[PDB]
Amino acid sequence: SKQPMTPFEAIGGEQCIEILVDTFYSYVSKHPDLSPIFPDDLTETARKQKQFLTQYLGGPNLYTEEHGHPMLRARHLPFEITPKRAEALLSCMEQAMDDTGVHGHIREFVFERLALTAQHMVNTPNETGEI
Amino acid sequence: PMTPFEAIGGEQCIEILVDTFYSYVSKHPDLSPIFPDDLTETARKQKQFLTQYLGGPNLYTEEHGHPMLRARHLPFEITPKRAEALLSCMEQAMDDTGVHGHIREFVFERLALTAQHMVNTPN
Ligand code: HEM
Ligand code: HEM
Ligand SMILES: [C-]#N
Ligand SMILES: [C-]#N
């Protein structure tokens, strides 16, 4: 009978998603591998990401209800996403999780999903020095 | 429901939008010198790229591999002024193919962001 928590619930629901995503882009805007390629004001980027991660983790379909199918690989096609930038993005997410208290099984679950997805986003080989 | 590609009109609307686009490019004195004299190949690949970017079939990457878009533009002298000129040509193409309203701003906001990422040379 008893419903398991959706991953969204397990992480702490809306209130946690808001904080983690805001802290996440705080690190993104201060990371030299990431600042240049994002929009200058990350407000609307963070709004879409809160909607996306909400439904990515099993909450309301907030993202697809507004923007349509995420098709993230297609949407990231024009941006220079190297492996180095994928690992930097993920590093910013790691530091935001520590800052917002995301730990244990739900942390390892949400992070591994995110690592895979960022691998799907890479669309540029690395610079010399990554053989 | 539903992808920007099918919202904008699909394959048919991509065809005339990209054709009109490069007609404007070929006439723009800030852009024409850096493009090939014959734009047939360029337009064909841009149709591929826009179709996939907007959520249609994966036409571009199925033929050309990873997009690495900025890297492909690096051999060309792309200033902020030329980025605006390109955008001006996409704007008139959208006016000329009837691309309006919410899907226009969706597509135009994203091409403006991409054009800024292609810039590789000061004015
Ligand atoms: C792997 C390295 C990545 C880089 C360098 C990167 C970079 C970017 C950039 C520059 C934008 C444009 C923002 C805008 O125009 O508003 C964007 C949008 C977005 N990214 Fe990422 N991204 C990466 C991976 C990811 C991952 C793992 C996710 C998983 C949630 C994700 C989800 C999104 C979403 C939902 C958007 C907004 C889509 C929209 O505008 O509708 N991205 N990303
Ligand atoms: C901002 C100003 C821009 C300038 C001055 C510019 C200029 C050029 C030039 C000179 C080429 C070489 C044409 C050829 O050899 O066939 C090219 C190719 C291309 N550009 Fe642009 N571009 C700009 C922005 C954009 C934007 C916003 C997009 C959006 C997707 C884009 C997508 C492409 C594609 C797909 C190709 C074909 C790449 C290939 O050869 O596989 N460019 N561009
Ligand atoms: C993408 N953040
Ligand atoms: C570029 N067209």
Q: Which residue of A has its CA nearest to B55?
A: A74
Contacts of A130 (CB under 8 A, 6+ apart): A83, A84
Do residues B118 and B34 lie in contact, with contact meaning Cβ atoms separated by under 8 Å? no
Contacts of A70 (CB under 8 A, 6+ apart): A52, A63, A64
Could you tell me the sign of the dihedral formed by the alpha carbons of B103, B108, B114, B117, in that order?
negative
Nearest Cα to A114, choosing from A96, A131, A126?
A96
Do residues B64 and B45 lie in contact, with contact meaning Cβ atoms separated by under 8 Å? yes
Which residues does chain A have within 8 Å of residue B3's beta carbon, measured at their own beta carbons?
68-69, 71
Do residues A53 and A100 lie in contact, with contact meaning Cβ atoms separated by under 8 Å? no
Element (H, E) at B5: helix B4-8
What resolution (Å)?
2.5
Could you tell me the sign of the dihedral formed by the alpha carbons of B48, B52, B58, B64, in that order?
positive
Instruction: Give the Cα separation of A123 and A83 in Å (integer).
Output: 8
Do residues A130 and A84 lie in contact, with contact meaning Cβ atoms separated by under 8 Å? yes
Contacts of B96 (CB under 8 A, 6+ apart): B20
For tokens 């996939």, the residue is B52
Instruction: Give the Cα separation of A7 and A9 in Å (integer).
Output: 5
B69 and A78 within 8 Å at the Cβ level: the answer is yes
Q: Which of B72, B113, B118, B120 to mutate to test the interface with A (most CBs of A within 10 A)?
A: B113
What 3-state DSSP class applies to B89?
helix
**Domain assignment of residue A92, given as a range:** 1-131
Do residues B21 and B44 lie in contact, with contact meaning Cβ atoms separated by under 8 Å? no
> Which tokens in the block code for residue A83?
């492996």
How many CA atoms, within 13 angstroms, populate the side-chain half-sphere of residue B107? Answer: 28
Q: What would the 3-class secondary structure string for chain A be? A: CCCCCCHHHHHCHHHHHHHHHHHHHHHHHCCCCCCCCCCCCCHHHHHHHHHHHHHHCCCCCHHHHHHCCCCHHHHCCCCCCCHHHHHHHHHHHHHHHHHHCCCHHHHHHHHHHHHHHHHHHCCCCCCCCCC
Residue B123 gets which letter from DSSP?
-
CATH classification at residue B103 = 1.10.490.10
Ligand index nearest the alpha carbon of residue B83: 2
Chain A residues with CB-CB distance to B under 8 A? Answer: 37, 39, 68-69, 71, 74-75, 77-80, 123-125
Which residues does chain A have within 8 Å of residue B66's beta carbon, measured at their own beta carbons?
123-125
Contacts of A91 (CB under 8 A, 6+ apart): A27, A31
For tokens 């690992």, the residue is A87
Domain count, chain A: 1
Do residues B39 and B82 lie in contact, with contact meaning Cβ atoms separated by under 8 Å? no
Distances (CA, A) of B53 to A52, A76, B111: 18, 8, 10
> Which tokens in the block code for residue B73?
């533009």
Nearest Cα to B22, choosing from B10, B31, B30?
B31
